[PDB]
Amino acid sequence: EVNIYGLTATALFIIIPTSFLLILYVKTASTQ
Amino acid sequence: EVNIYGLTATALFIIIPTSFLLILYVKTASTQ
Amino acid sequence: SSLWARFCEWITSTENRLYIGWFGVIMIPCLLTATSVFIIAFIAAPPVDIDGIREPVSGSLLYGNNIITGAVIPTSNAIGLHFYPIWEAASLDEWLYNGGPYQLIVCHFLLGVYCYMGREWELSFRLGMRPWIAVAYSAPVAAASAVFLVYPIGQGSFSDGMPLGISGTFNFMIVFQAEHNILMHPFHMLGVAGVFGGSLFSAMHGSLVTSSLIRETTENESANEGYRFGQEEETYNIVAAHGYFGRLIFQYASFNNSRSLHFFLAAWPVIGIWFTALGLSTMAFNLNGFNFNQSVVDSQGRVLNTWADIINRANLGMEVMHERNAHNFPLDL
Amino acid sequence: MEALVYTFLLVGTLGIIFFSIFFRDPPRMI
Amino acid sequence: MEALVYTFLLVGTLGIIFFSIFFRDPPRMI
Amino acid sequence: ARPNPNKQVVELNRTSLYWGLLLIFVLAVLFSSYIFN
Amino acid sequence: ARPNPNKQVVELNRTSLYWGLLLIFVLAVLFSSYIFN
Amino acid sequence: GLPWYRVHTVVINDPGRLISVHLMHTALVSGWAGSMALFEISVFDPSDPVLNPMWRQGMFVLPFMTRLGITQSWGGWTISGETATNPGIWSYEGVAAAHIILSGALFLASVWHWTYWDLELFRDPRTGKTALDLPKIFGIHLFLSGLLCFGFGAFHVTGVFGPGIWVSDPYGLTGRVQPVAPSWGADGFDPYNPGGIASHHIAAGILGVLAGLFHLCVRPSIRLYFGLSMGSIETVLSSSIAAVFWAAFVVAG
Amino acid sequence: AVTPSLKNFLGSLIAGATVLGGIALAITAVSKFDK
Amino acid sequence: RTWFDDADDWLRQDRFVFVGWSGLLLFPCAYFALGGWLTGTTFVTSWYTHGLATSYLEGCNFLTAAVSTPANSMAHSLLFVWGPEAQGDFTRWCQLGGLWAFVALHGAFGLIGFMLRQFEIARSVNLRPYNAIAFSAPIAVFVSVFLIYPLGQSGWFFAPSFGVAAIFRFILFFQGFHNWTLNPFHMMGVAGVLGAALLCAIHGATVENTLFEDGDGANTFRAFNPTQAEETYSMVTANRFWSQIFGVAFSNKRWLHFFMLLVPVTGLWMSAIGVVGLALNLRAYDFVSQEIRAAEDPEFETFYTKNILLNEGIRAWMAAQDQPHERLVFPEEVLPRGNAL
Amino acid sequence: FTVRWLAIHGIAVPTIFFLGAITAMQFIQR
Amino acid sequence: ILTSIRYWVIHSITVPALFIAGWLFVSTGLAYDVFGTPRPNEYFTEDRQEAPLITDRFNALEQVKKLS
Amino acid sequence: PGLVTPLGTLLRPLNSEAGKVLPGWGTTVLMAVFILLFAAFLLIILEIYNSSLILDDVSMSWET
Amino acid sequence: ALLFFFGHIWHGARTIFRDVFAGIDDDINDQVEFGKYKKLGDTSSL
Amino acid sequence: GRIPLWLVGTEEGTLAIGAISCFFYGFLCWF
Ligand code: CLA
Ligand code: CLA
Ligand code: CLA
Ligand SMILES: CCCCCCCCCCCCCCCCCC(=O)OC[C@H](CO[C@@H]1O[C@H](CO)[C@H](O)[C@H](O)[C@H]1O)OC(=O)CCCCCCCCCCCCCCCCC
Ligand SMILES: CCCCCCCCCCCCCCCC(=O)OC[C@H](CO[C@@H]1O[C@H](CS(=O)(=O)O)[C@@H](O)[C@H](O)[C@H]1O)OC(=O)CCCCCCCCCCCCCCC
Ligand SMILES: CCCCCCCCCCCCCCCC(=O)OC[C@H](COP(=O)(O)OC[C@@H](O)CO)OC(=O)CCCCCCCCCCCCCCC
Ligand SMILES: CCCCCCCCCCCCCCCC(=O)OC[C@H](COP(=O)(O)OC[C@@H](O)CO)OC(=O)CCCCCCCCCCCCCCC
Ligand SMILES: CC1=C(/C=C/C(C)=C/C=C/C(C)=C/C=C/C=C(C)/C=C/C=C(C)/C=C/C2=C(C)CCCC2(C)C)C(C)(C)CCC1
Ligand SMILES: CC1=C(/C=C/C(C)=C/C=C/C(C)=C/C=C/C=C(C)/C=C/C=C(C)/C=C/C2=C(C)CCCC2(C)C)C(C)(C)CCC1
Ligand SMILES: [Cl-]
Ligand SMILES: [Cl-]
Ligand SMILES: [Fe+2]
């Protein structure tokens, strides 16, 4: 049986550091 | 039965527009 | 200098951010009490006998209720109008069974909102405005006190007050229509006209002012940067807006005075809500709605039917099903 | 399980209320 | 269910490879 | 002109940040009970 | 001094963007089979 | 400083980048088409079409392929129950994979225009500004739409060169894919007559070709030109959204 | 082969044309009268 | 010069009223909706379709008069005066309930003419067209409850009749058959309506209360020049007021009036979407979880499971006289009794 | 004529007819 | 809105004419036959002691005159 | 002075006619005639589909 | 469909009102009077 | 001079009050 929690853990570990890096990149490339 | 699809839908509808607004706010408040 | 003088100067200062004043010393702790009881009782309240007929009713999130169905259950009918605090109860597993936190939260929330109205007077007087914000705030205070205090006094039980929840609000409203026929009551139609006219007048004024904003910015950036804060220039051409409205409908239904327009905005929905606030208080004392049963009669003597004679069937259907396990004697609910 | 989701959403709404009240931009003059 | 997650992760890795190759910053001179 | 003469900047202030986050959480609080059913 | 004399700026270029995103997806591709089990 | 709700207004006056985002939108729609087709194949159960039809299973984009005649998969099973030998190129999975290939191709087409947007088509040869000739563009597009409409009605519907469409028993028992005889009398407007759908596009594409060539040739009046602001571009968007939601109530009804 | 439905129908396409013609004639009767 | 020039000279000449290029629609296509509603409430019965005597001529009052919907056997015909159901016989056309289909389908163009007249004066007097986009929301409401709802639901009979005591029947119709209460789109709608009614009272009781000092007497209405370059209410003072009482407070009276524009139209559009979803009978009726738990465990009894058991009591009592074309007469044993309440 | 002439008459002309009708309804000796 | 005295021949004479016409349009009972509403002893025929029920669609002009 | 392609040389006369429009009325009255015919066509098919206009060859029986 | 109705109304407004897209001009005249100017802004016969 | 507008409005108010009083009288026991 597939995990109840596994797809949630996968999607969270995808989306959270991705958004964390996108914030910093857009803040950086805004100035220059 | 609980919507295991539904909890992922809840978490995605939380995190995606939140990150979308945070990118724009940090880009805005970077300059000023 | 003195302790009391320095304390009064601090409490009537206008530089602390959220103002306090002298009504604030009852507004702040009492509403914090009501909030701190309500958040706990919305989450982890045990089931409550609302009926006094030994049938507990689940209302909290932990016992199989979501956000819509979650509610703080009102007090049992055997408790009546008796004041029932924590210290008169036996245990906290006995206070929560007989409609505990509703009795506390309602009596806290009312004393909170009256002192909040006093605070809205007090800060206006401390700044030097004209004092009539509290008069306008008197309308939802009346609308809260009519369903939380006046109607349970009239019915003689705290059971028939409004349950503190989304799905409980509608079970208050439908049974109120069943026993009192609120739609066929002229105060309630005045309140419906109040809320619909308030929405109309808000959308109309917010259209006719936004449609006359003076161009001060470009067309790439925001249209809200044209108003620098704390200026002296009228950012909307009220002459052109009034001319547009006069061409649109009438020149003798003018309201050319901006101050007359604002008096009309302040007095339409407030007087709209005041009549429903009286209407609930009148229906609390069993002064009923209208009644057009069997009005249209033919020349023989038989009974014809109208829309009132269909609403009578719907209210019979509600009435023979509300409070299904209590009523034995054929009337007085 | 879903009760924790409900409680998290209510507490997050109250937190955004808190930060909106206290950590706003100051409405500044001329 | 999980096969779609596997395929999505592999295709996303290949997409980041594609954007890294073609949409890099130009390595510029003096 | 090879560089774009229409590169323009998005802008989103703190008031709009609070409005957007409050909108998303209020929508979540409302629809979550019906989604979980 | 009431305003902070140490307000400083974070900086993250496009090379580091690609490295971070590739790291996150490679970690996901590796651990996803063991998480799903 | 633009607000967040008008960030696509930087391509009001940049038609190559406008074509680039048209291409990217088309690629995303085709990508949804292919992915939904593959997911619906993987969920779909062909076990018994007598008591477990397609619509009990919640199947969505497969009763459009079956509607326009795609009745066979690579597994060998068909819709009515028997098996067919030759699947050909065009099975369900082949249609899905073709849409994925379209998605990738339109992606790579979308990259090229915004990389090289500054060509010399999008330039007034007369005076030297960046305009576009909207009635002639409309004549071209209406001519193309008429050609595809006429070809679809003539060949693929009536079974001249295409394989036809699903025309069924009205009592819902013995439906199959058939070439359709286009009827031209008064029964062509009865919407329970597939000959009406057949004879529709034959007239529709011809009239569209005629009107498209008409707009390629003639030029409008100054009265209607200033009255509708045809030099602007956003009047086309306002007219197109109108036509689209007029179509939507028809396809819903 | 005209049914009674089409019979009473075509009078409506007559009548709406008469209404719009009455509108247009009411425009011409006073517009070019004044100018 | 030519035609379409003197016809633009006139229709845009100014008088007391303003007829225009869409006033030529609005004034003829409306006012017959008003006349038809007044005619149906005063003179015209409803004895044949419903079974209800609902006219001023039949003893009803202003509350209980309604231009009534046609019977269910007139399924979705447009019900013209001439044609396959009335054949031009005007008395039979009024008896068959054609007046409702006159007034509704005739004033649906009245709304279009009014919004285009509102759109045309805003081009004549050169102003921004934000007054036009607000009136689209009651048009969406009118279409959603009077037009799209009876189309996909087997009859014009299942439509709110033009009256006062008939709208109440329509409200209890939704409350007892559809459970329109539990619709999140209706939650959006009541939030929009009631918040707009809030913010109207707030702005009205704020602006003329933080007012400046121009006149001499206490009658502050007599101290306003309509041709004025100054202000009339202290924005800084009201900002400090509502900032210290409530917390967040506005600072931009562009955004204030735009927010007053934006709230009730958002509420009414987000109610119209739910009325569409109810027209397709995708109602917000019972859940899964509490029902499968309450069938197992008897003593559960939430307000939810009381509202469902009350709506069943609505739907089993009102139907046998609400819709006679079903031809059903319930015995008294079948009805939800409650054991002698 | 005049548009003002028409807007004065053509609304209020059937009004007295309907008011006399309603008064006759009310004085129906039923 | 105050410019009117005008005790006028066309104005002040024709208003009671419309009033008496609206009176007689009901009191003669003509409106009942014009718009088809029943009279207080005509709701129930002796062969039909119920509300009427319009059954079929295309023959309604033949059915309502039966129901009268 | 932009970018030059063979398609840029081919399709350029299509993007050549920058704003040449007719003085006067043009084909406006004929356009109005076609619009009225299209409105009558939609009214025809709407009343057929509602069966407020019964024909001979139109069955509307869900049985063909 | 119902949402594209509103989108169409918005773009139909914003197409025609391009010149006054972001605010009225500083010099709206005295043509907002009731009966003096006998035509709403058009200059054919005043 | 003319008959004044207040004297017109008083008589219009009496015409309103009489018709509304007859409306209540026909509301009570008439149909
Ligand atoms: C055919 C569809 C279509 C197209 C091509 C456009 C195009 C445009 N609109 Mg528009 N609009 C549409 C439909 C459309 N609209 C509809 C239906 C509405 C009514 C709701 C509006 C309401 C509207 C307003 C109110 C405004 C525009 C504006 C604009 C312009 C800039 C857009 C921008 O930067 O916003 C960027 C917006 C976003 C990035 C927000 C996107 C987030 C959404 C809400 C969630 C994602 C949706 C999701 C993917 C599902 C959609 C798929 C499918 C179902 C459609 C642009 C010309 C602006 C304008 O006039 O320029 C000044 C403007 O202010 N539009
Ligand atoms: C601008 C005003 C206006 C508009 C838009 C409408 C619109 C409508 N009316 Mg209406 N009506 C009006 C004024 C108007 N009315 C007036 C003034 C009266 C009082 C006499 C009425 C009395 C009335 C009744 C009694 C009824 C309607 C009905 C209707 C509806 C259906 C009509 C139909 O099928 O005809 C369709 C008409 C056309 C398609 C127009 C024909 C155009 C074609 C293309 C012919 C081309 C023009 C033609 C050649 C004439 C030109 C003359 C030439 C010499 C220049 C429709 C919504 C019916 C209704 O309410 O439905 C229940 C109904 O029974 N109307
Ligand atoms: C609420 C209705 C409504 C409103 C207010 C508007 C408003 C507008 N539309 Mg519009 N439109 C609508 C519905 C509406 N539309 C519908 C349903 C369609 C069909 C898809 C269109 C198609 C459309 C196009 C194609 C264009 C507009 C344009 C415009 C703009 C210019 C005004 C104009 O020429 O309109 C025209 C007037 C109307 C649409 C109102 C209808 C008036 C006629 C007389 C009704 C016909 C009655 C008919 C005879 C009844 C018989 C049928 C009945 C029996 C069922 C304006 C913003 C133009 C624009 O934005 O560019 C500048 C433009 O090019 N519209
Ligand atoms: C005021 C003017 C009034 C004019 C009135 C008359 C209008 C007619 C105008 C001419 C229209 C011609 C088209 C006629 C097609 C009839 C369709 C039909 O009947 O379908 C039916 C036919 C018959 O087809 C068969 O019919 C059978 C009937 O049972 C079956 O259905 C079969 O399945 C079906 O295949 O379909 C066809 O085969 C049509 C194919 C013919 C197409 C010819 C190709 C044209 C190529 C043009 C090349 C142009 C080159 C120049 C461009 C250069 C590029 C730069
Ligand atoms: C066991 C029970 C547990 C109970 C826990 C209770 C939790 C709730 C406590 C509230 C915490 C949040 C507010 C604290 C921040 C604050 O004080 O503002 C910071 C400012 C700063 O003032 C400045 O404050 C200075 C003091 S300080 O150093 O800055 O703190 C002072 O010197 C200066 O004069 C003045 O300008 O304080 C004031 O403006 C007034 C102080 C009192 C206002 C706070 C009470 C308001 C609560 C609202 C109640 C209604 C809510 C209903 C429920 C939703
Ligand atoms: C008058 C001309 C009008 C043409 C309108 C064409 C509109 C565009 C259609 C493109 C999609 C085609 C539909 C799928 C078509 C399709 O699926 O074909 C299918 C087929 C390939 O698949 P298969 O042979 O395997 O068929 C499947 C079965 O055999 C197996 O069971 O293609 C052909 O053999 C010939 C196709 C010719 C198609 C010609 C189109 C290309 C040339 C067009 C040039 C026109 C220029 C006109 C200038 C005036
Ligand atoms: C003293 C104790 C009593 C007060 C305590 C309660 C305070 C309530 C504070 C409301 C915070 C909302 C912030 C809005 C976001 C915000 O910060 O707005 C900020 C905004 C600031 O306006 P500005 O002039 O600064 O904007 C300038 C422009 O550039 C952009 O607008 O203020 C408002 O418009 C007031 C609107 C309040 C609307 C409040 C309605 C919220 C309803 C409740 C939603 C949550 C549901 C609760 C259920 C769990
Ligand atoms: C949330 C939600 C929403 C929205 C939705 C949407 C909008 C979706 C979309 C989705 C999508 C949008 C999908 C798609 C995807 C795509 C894909 C998946 C594809 C990709 C591509 C590929 C895979 C390709 C590759 C390639 C290249 C590039 C090169 C060559 C080779 C090839 C071709 C292979 C709504 C509210 C409305 C509803 C409900 C839900
Ligand atoms: C049917 C029909 C038609 C139409 C006709 C018309 C056009 C009509 C009109 C009508 C009208 C024209 C109506 C009106 C009505 C109204 C009335 C009758 C009024 C009443 C009122 C009163 C009674 C008063 C009230 C009040 C006020 C407001 C003031 C003070 C006092 C009180 C409050 C009481 C036609 C043939 C086309 C077609 C077919 C159908
Ligand atoms: Cl009792
Ligand atoms: Cl209950
Ligand atoms: Fe205001």
CSV table of C-alpha atoms in Angstrom, one decimal, chain A residues 10 13, chain E residues 6 9, chain G residues 25-37:
chain,number,residue,atom,x,y,z
A,10,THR,CA,7.4,14.6,-1.5
A,13,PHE,CA,10.2,18.8,0.0
E,6,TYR,CA,8.5,9.3,-10.5
E,9,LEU,CA,10.6,14.1,-11.0
G,25,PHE,CA,15.3,17.4,-7.6
G,26,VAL,CA,18.2,14.9,-7.5
G,27,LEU,CA,17.6,14.4,-3.7
G,28,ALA,CA,14.0,13.9,-4.5
G,29,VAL,CA,14.7,11.4,-7.3
G,30,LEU,CA,17.0,9.4,-5.0
G,31,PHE,CA,14.9,9.4,-1.8
G,32,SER,CA,11.4,9.1,-3.3
G,33,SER,CA,11.5,5.4,-3.9
G,34,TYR,CA,12.6,4.8,-0.3
G,35,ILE,CA,10.0,7.1,1.1
G,36,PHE,CA,7.2,5.5,-0.9
G,37,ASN,CA,8.7,2.1,0.1
